């Protein structure tokens, strides 16, 4: 790892700023595309709409970020039932062999950009039914997954930590800078 910086060292460090790219771009067109990508990523991270895809027990914790203690609504996060209106699909439960074409069709009808959160050990790696005859060995064999939330029923702080990690990934998305360098 790295040691987290001591406050004597960290007082000499300057402020990071909001932009992961920095304001030190050379060209004015590159700087304008950087700020446009910053505004676009702020709009995308300011409201991600996850889809009501609750397969198994993990989803009982998924409603617990809907719950008044954790309150996902002040993070841009609000559930949508239709897959067209939703940004994120949260695979929260056990993907089985009869569940595989349904999950693939629901993911394919979702419009791009598409970030996928694997909630729980049945969602990533198979988990407690990994050696079962009718359980897919994780959802990574079917749906491409950006965030993997570890706990068997993830606490709801850990699922919301996965949500904040997805927001940091969305804030780190480089589209217009790649277009300028394509």
């Amino acid at each position: 790892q790295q040691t987290l910086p001591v406050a004597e060292v960290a007082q000499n460090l300057p402020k990071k700023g909001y932009s992961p790219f920095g304001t030190k771009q050379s060209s004015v067109a590159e700087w304008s595309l950087a700020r446009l990508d910053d505004l676009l990523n702020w709009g995308r991270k300011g409201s991600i709409w996850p889809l009501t895809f609750g397969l198994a027990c993990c989803a009982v914790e998924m409603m617990h970020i809907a719950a008044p203690r954790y309150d996902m609504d002040r993070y841009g996060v609000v559930f949508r039932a239709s897959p067209r209106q939703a940004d994120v699909i949260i695979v929260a439960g056990t993907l089985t062999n009869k569940m595989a074409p349904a999950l693939r069709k629901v993911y394919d009808q979702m419009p791009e950009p598409r970030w996928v959160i694997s909630m729980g050990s049945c969602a990533n790696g198979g988990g407690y039914y990994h050696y079962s005859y009718s359980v897919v060995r994780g959802c990574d064999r079917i749906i491409p997954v950006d965030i993997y939330v570890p706990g068997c029923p993830p606490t709801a702080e850990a699922l919301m930590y996965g949500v904040l990690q997805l927001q940091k990934k969305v804030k780190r998305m480089k589209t217009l800078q790649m277009w300028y360098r394509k």
Binding site: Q1, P68, R69, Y70, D71, R74, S121, N124, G125, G126, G127, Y128, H130, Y131, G138, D140, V145, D146, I147, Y148, V149, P150, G151, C152, P154, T155, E157, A158, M160, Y161, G162, L164, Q165, K169
Partner: protein, 186 residues
């Protein structure tokens, strides 16, 4: 007080057992509640009274919710105060692991110790059940307090021996405090 349709016994309680009242005062009361939305007015007032209540939103991550000293989180491998690793490769944790996440391969070290050459826990397979820390004769494997360990990539949740030893080095104070405050319960 309406009469009972079914006589209620001693050990039971009956719902929707009241007779519908037929005197004119109760009929006018039910009629006014139907016409002028009195029960809907009570529902609206009860709803509006919860705006003035305190919000229970705990403002993550500046303020985090309550936990317990028994809490099951990231598995981690502890060490002795002298510095030697605690895990004697005795393999009760892998025998008791119900999802069979733990893989142990052991060889004799140069000084003759039993300590492991491979200790892998598949955290995508681990169900965080805590059977390994109960089945550990020494206090080697332990459930750490950490649960903010979501990964970008599937392979990064395949925990090696070095990752578990680094988790034991990083989280030693809180794990030792929980084990000091929890060992007499177990």
């Amino acid at each position: 007080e309406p009469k009972d349709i079914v006589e209620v016994p001693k050990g039971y309680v009956y719902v929707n057992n009241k007779e519908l009242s037929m005197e004119f005062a109760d009929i006018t009361d039910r009629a006014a509640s139907t016409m002028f939305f009195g029960e809907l007015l009570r529902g609206f007032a009860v709803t509006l009274a919860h705006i003035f209540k305190e919000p229970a939103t705990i403002n993550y991550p500046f303020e985090k919710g309550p936990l317990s000293p028994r809490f099951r989180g990231e598995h981690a491998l502890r060490r002795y105060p002298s510095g030697e690793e605690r895990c004697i490769a005795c393999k009760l944790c892998e025998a008791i692991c119900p999802a069979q996440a733990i893989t142990i391969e052991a060889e004799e070290r140069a000084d003759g110790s039993r300590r492991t050459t491979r200790y892998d826990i598949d955290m995508t397979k681990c169900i965080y059940c805590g059977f390994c820390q109960e089945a550990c004769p020494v206090d080697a494997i332990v459930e750490g307090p950490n649960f903010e360990f979501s990964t970008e990539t599937h392979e990064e949740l395949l925990y090696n021996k070095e990752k578990l030893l680094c988790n034991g080095d990083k989280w030693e104070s809180e794990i030792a405090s929980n084990l000091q405050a929890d060992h007499l319960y177990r």
